[PDB]
Amino acid sequence: RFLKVKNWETDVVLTDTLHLKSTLETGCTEHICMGSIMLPTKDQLFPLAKEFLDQYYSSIKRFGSKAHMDRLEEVNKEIESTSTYQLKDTELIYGAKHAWRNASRCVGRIQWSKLQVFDARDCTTAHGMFNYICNHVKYATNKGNLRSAITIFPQRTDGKHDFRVWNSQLIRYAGYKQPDGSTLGDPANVQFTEICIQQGWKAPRGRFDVLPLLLQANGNDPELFQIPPELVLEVPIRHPKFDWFKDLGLKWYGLPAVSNMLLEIGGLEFSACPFSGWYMGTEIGVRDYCDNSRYNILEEVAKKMDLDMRKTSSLWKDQALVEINIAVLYSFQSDKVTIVDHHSATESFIKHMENEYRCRGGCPADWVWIVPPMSGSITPVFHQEMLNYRLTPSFEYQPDPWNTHVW
Amino acid sequence: RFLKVKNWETDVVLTDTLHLKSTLETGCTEHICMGSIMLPVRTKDQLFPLAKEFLDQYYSSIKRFGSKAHMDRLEEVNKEIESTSTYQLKDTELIYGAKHAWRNASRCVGRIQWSKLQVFDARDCTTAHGMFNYICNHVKYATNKGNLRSAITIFPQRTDGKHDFRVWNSQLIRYAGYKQPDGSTLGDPANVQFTEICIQQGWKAPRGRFDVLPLLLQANGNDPELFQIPPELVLEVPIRHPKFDWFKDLGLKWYGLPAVSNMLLEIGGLEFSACPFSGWYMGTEIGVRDYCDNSRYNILEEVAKKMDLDMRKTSSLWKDQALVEINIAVLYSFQSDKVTIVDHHSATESFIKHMENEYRCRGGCPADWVWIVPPMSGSITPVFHQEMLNYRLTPSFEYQPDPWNTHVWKG
Numbered sequence: 001r002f003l004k005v006k007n008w009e010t011d012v013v014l015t016d017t018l019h020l021k022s023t024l025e026t027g028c029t030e031h032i033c034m035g036s037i038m039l040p041t042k043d044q045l046f047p048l049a050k051e052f053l054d055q056y057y058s059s060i061k062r063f064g065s066k067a068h069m070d071r072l073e074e075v076n077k078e079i080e081s082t083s084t085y086q087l088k089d090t091e092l093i094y095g096a097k098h099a100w101r102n103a104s105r106c107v108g109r110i111q112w113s114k115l116q117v118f119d120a121r122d123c124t125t126a127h128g129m130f131n132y133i134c135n136h137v138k139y140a141t142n143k144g145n146l147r148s149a150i151t152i153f154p155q156r157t158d159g160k161h162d163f164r165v166w167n168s169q170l171i172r173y174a175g176y177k178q179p180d181g182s183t184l185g186d187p188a189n190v191q192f193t194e195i196c197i198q199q200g201w202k203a204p205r206g207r208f209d210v211l212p213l214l215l216q217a218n219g220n221d222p223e224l225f226q227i228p229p230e231l232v233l234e235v236p237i238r239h240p241k242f243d244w245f246k247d248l249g250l251k252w253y254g255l256p257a258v259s260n261m262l263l264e265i266g267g268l269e270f271s272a273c274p275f276s277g278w279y280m281g282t283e284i285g286v287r288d289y290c291d292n293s294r295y296n297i298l299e300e301v302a303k304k305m306d307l308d309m310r311k312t313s314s315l316w317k318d319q320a321l322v323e324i325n326i327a328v329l330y331s332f333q334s335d336k337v338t339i340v341d342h343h344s345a346t347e348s349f350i351k352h353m354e355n356e357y358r359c360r361g362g363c364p365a366d367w368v369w370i371v372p373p374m375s376g377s378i379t380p381v382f383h384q385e386m387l388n389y390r391l392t393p394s395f396e397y398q399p400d401p402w403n404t405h406v407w
Numbered sequence: 408r409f410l411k412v413k414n415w416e417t418d419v420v421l422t423d424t425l426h427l428k429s430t431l432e433t434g435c436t437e438h439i440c441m442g443s444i445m446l447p448v449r450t451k452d453q454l455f456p457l458a459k460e461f462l463d464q465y466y467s468s469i470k471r472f473g474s475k476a477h478m479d480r481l482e483e484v485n486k487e488i489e490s491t492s493t494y495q496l497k498d499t500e501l502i503y504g505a506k507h508a509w510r511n512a513s514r515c516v517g518r519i520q521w522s523k524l525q526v527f528d529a530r531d532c533t534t535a536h537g538m539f540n541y542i543c544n545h546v547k548y549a550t551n552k553g554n555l556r557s558a559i560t561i562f563p564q565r566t567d568g569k570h571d572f573r574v575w576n577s578q579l580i581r582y583a584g585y586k587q588p589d590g591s592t593l594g595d596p597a598n599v600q601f602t603e604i605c606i607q608q609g610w611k612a613p614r615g616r617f618d619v620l621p622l623l624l625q626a627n628g629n630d631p632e633l634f635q636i637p638p639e640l641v642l643e644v645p646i647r648h649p650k651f652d653w654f655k656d657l658g659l660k661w662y663g664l665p666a667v668s669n670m671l672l673e674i675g676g677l678e679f680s681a682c683p684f685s686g687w688y689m690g691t692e693i694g695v696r697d698y699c700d701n702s703r704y705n706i707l708e709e710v711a712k713k714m715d716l717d718m719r720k721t722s723s724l725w726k727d728q729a730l731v732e733i734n735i736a737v738l739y740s741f742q743s744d745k746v747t748i749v750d751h752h753s754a755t756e757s758f759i760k761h762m763e764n765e766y767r768c769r770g771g772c773p774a775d776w777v778w779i780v781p782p783m784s785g786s787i788t789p790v791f792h793q794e795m796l797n798y799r800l801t802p803s804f805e806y807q808p809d810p811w812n813t814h815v816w817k818g
């Protein structure tokens with residue numbers, strides 16, 4: 001019930017007391033660990049409100065004050081009456097920052113307190129959402145000097161009026177399945193890309209076509225919008241030593257911006273809440289480029305390097321994987337667009353773990369996701385025991401809306 | 408209750424019913440996952456259930472379930488427990504049990520090989536010298552001049568827990584480490600303490616960078632004894648790189664035989680506290696962990712120096728770059744000297760096939776993702792993308808305290 005975690009490289013031992021505030025469930029039991037699965041009323045709402053307001057007022061050193069009790073009172077009044085309630089701006093800012101502090105899969109959390117929050121609760125139409133998103137993208141991009149932000153659309157009501165952003169990120173490349181049997185562009189997005197066509201987009205049918213936003217306001221059918229091309233910062237990918245690398249014609253976008261998640265604050269559900277920071281190099285170079293189900297460019301790169309592709313034990317995949325990742329980091333740095341490498345990012349997160357243990361008595365972390373998809377054991381998070389648990393406020397997954405929505 | 412695991416690269420879904428036969432706890436609850444935590448005297452009363460379970464399993468596998476022979480054996484074990492408070496396994500049960508312990512080892516990527524395992528019965532062993540003899544035979548048989556064969560050696564089970572057989576070494580073959588007055592380490596930092604025990608026990612240490620440690624052996628609860636493995640029996644491989652001629656001047660070598668000697672084999676409630684077992688290496692165990700962990704040989708800097716990589720900022724990926732070269736070198740060296748080894752692409756691909764086979768024939772395969780995914784190039788191996796269920800079956804390999812922490816010195 002007081003739990004220790006050890007680092008096996010530094011012998012440093014931390015004690016975790018924060019897990020005892022754990023509210024949600026893991027998928028795990030005493031008989032089966034599910035640590036590696038990707039996805040494992042008036043009544044219910046007041047408990048959830050109180051727990052949140054309790055943490056808010058405690059965090060402002062005002063726990064048990066009249067202001068605290070008054071708000072608890074007022075929120076109670078409002079729920080009994082209206083069956084939901086509204087967050088004060090300050091609460092909303094605190095809850096969003098905290099949903100990020102609590103994301104156990106995020107290596108980037110040392111940054112959690114510098115989140116710019118844009119309150120879009122007054123938005124009513126998709127065009128409004130388009131406007132709020134364009135502003136988010138531009139503020140966050142900041143001419144390549146990236147700044148973290150989140151934009152919060154109105155909260156769920158009766159569930160018949162959700163605001164959703166259909167895209168999974170604000171900025172992603174299209175995918176088209178070809179007669180040739182293969183797949184052009186990003187195969188992750190094939191299905192979404194078809195819905196844009198079914199909804200009316202005219203795809204350039206290219207390899208790196210920035211997708212149209214598909215926006216749903218007040219539970220209405222969703223609507224198409226192109227992001228002003230001038231707002232979508234992109235980086236052409238070159239190598240500091242391999243001149244031929246440019247000839248691959250690889251580019252990636254600067255702005256990682258997750259748009260399909262659901263933000264839960266004090267019981268309220270914000271089903272559209274796109275947020276963004278900046279990339280860790282491996283996200284693009286290891287996963288986007290090299291996953292079999294993605295752009296999968298290892299075969300082609302290794303060929304240009306003239307490596308012995310005859311046998312797996314030449315480690316030609318591994319060799320090419322490194323150079324690709326050097327190239328991503330090099331390109332972004334040269335174009336002055338913010339990026340972080342896996343060494344620096346995991347080192348930073350260890351320091352952030354330290355701080356959270358000292359100051360909060362823990363830090364939920366999911367090892368499976370925190371350890372980078374290349375060079376695991378040479379980054380220090382590999383050697384670091386972590387405890388994974390669910391704290392609220394939080395971001396949660398939700399079904400792709402095309403399975404949910406009715407036309 | 409059925410459970411599905413998905414593969415995110417192939418969309419293959421598999422169904423697990425085998426987790427239904429799970430006994431021991433994981434360490435996880437509905438409120439906490441402890442899946443990345445490294446480590447999360449028996450009465451008659453607890454014993455016969457565990458005996459019976461095991462023998463039902465055994466007897467199913469040989470398709471004799473409920474036979475006369477099954478029933479006789481149950482009754483026999485029953486009596487033997489009530490009379491002597493324990494029981495002895497037949498050879499066939501021992502064999503079956505040990506294979507299954509491996510089969511159930513959810514942190515083991517090599518399990519496709521689970522059924523080819525040479526079992527050596529050392530249950531007649533009575534002394535440390537007797538242990539040494541058995542172990543030398545094990546090293547030599549398994550080594551097989553480079554064409555490694557899986558094997559395990561099983562010494563007598565625990566009785567009152569005052570008479571334990573233990574191999575104080577964590578592996579039968581490992582290099583010494585010596586902390587120096589300046590704070591640096593000569594040799595393998597992982598073995599500093601055990602080295603010190605060996606020294607304190609009377610071993611004269613060469614004090615080199617690759618000194619094969621002496622076996623330190625405990626029989627029947629007695630104080631342990633030092634023995635040097637005959638060096639002619641210790642197959643080693645000098646490390647060179649196919650392209651970099653300066654690689655050999657680093658002076659690296661490694662031993663061919665990975666042989667774990669610190670685990671506890673549980674079978675039908677019986678506890679075998681000395682059961683050294685051996686396989687062959689996955690290249691990354693040496694190349695990534697043994698050479699490149701900061702708390703081991705830690706050679707990244709010196710390889711990168713020699714490669715003249717840009718070392719001034721991490722974002723050159725100089726570490727990742729040296730790491731690959733070293734792993735190329737380990738694998739090249741072993742193949743060149745004809746010592747069996749497997750690379751991590753080939754090991755993980757084979758493991759995915761074993762795993763699907765296990766679903767189809769057995770109704771599952773417990774697997775620990777944190778351990779199965781190699782410690783370099785994670786996502787370019789097919790296991791990264793495989794959802795896994797982790798749960799404990801018996802028979803099994805368990806951890807146990809290091810024996811200097813618990814042993815009662817007779818002096």
Ligand code: HEM
Pocket residue numbers: 100103105106107108109111115148149150258261275276277278279280283340345369395
């Ligand atoms: C500052 C730059 C940031 C870096 C380098 C970063 C890093 C990461 C990484 C490496 C992942 C794993 C995802 C994957 O591999 O596909 C992740 C997931 C996540 N991050 Fe962060 N992050 C950053 C900013 C943020 C911000 C601003 C938020 C919230 C406001 C956030 C919340 C999350 C959430 C909720 C997930 C899980 C996504 C999922 O489960 O699918 N990240 N982030």
Ligand code: HEM
Pocket residue numbers: 509512514515516517518520524557558559667670684685686687688689692749754778804
């Ligand atoms: C065929 C050759 C084999 C290969 C390539 C292989 C590979 C591995 C690897 C990579 C690990 C993770 C250890 C680490 O990275 O530190 C492992 C762990 C394990 N293996 Fe296998 N293995 C093989 C044979 C065997 C045999 C013969 C047994 C027992 C009969 C076995 C039982 C285990 C156990 C119990 C663990 C976990 C050890 C621990 O947590 O301390 N392995 N093996």
Ligand SMILES: Cc1cc(N)nc(COCC[C@@H](CN)OCc2cc(C)cc(N)n2)c1
Pocket residue numbers: 256257258275276277278279280283397
């Ligand atoms: C298929 C799938 C399902 C699922 N639930 N999650 C994933 C992976 O998460 C997708 C979003 C990932 C992709 N690199 O980005 C996380 C992230 C967010 C932010 C704000 C910054 C950053 N660098 N990285 C994939």
Ligand SMILES: Cc1cc(N)nc(COCC[C@@H](CN)OCc2cc(C)cc(N)n2)c1
Pocket residue numbers: 445517665666667669684685686687688689692806
């Ligand atoms: C903390 C800790 C405790 C403990 N008992 N074991 C470990 C790590 O495992 C050590 C043994 C590892 C070394 N790579 O060997 C596993 C293995 C066994 C066998 C039979 C073959 C093989 N290739 N690999 C770590």
Ligand SMILES: C[C@H](O)[C@H](O)[C@H]1CNc2nc(N)[nH]c(=O)c2N1
Pocket residue numbers: 035036037038368369370371415791792793794795
């Ligand atoms: C099956 C497994 O859970 C899945 O492949 C996970 C593994 N770890 C990951 N880690 C990160 N950061 N991102 C991912 O998408 C994944 N995928």
Ligand SMILES: C[C@H](O)[C@H](O)[C@H]1CNc2nc(N)[nH]c(=O)c2N1
Pocket residue numbers: 008382383384385386442443444445777778779
């Ligand atoms: C804390 C963490 O569980 C620990 O470093 C584990 C991670 N995965 C591992 N995986 C293997 N194969 N071997 C190891 O020693 C470890 N160490």
Ligand SMILES: [Zn+2]
Pocket residue numbers: 028032033034035435439440441442
């Ligand atoms: Zn778990």
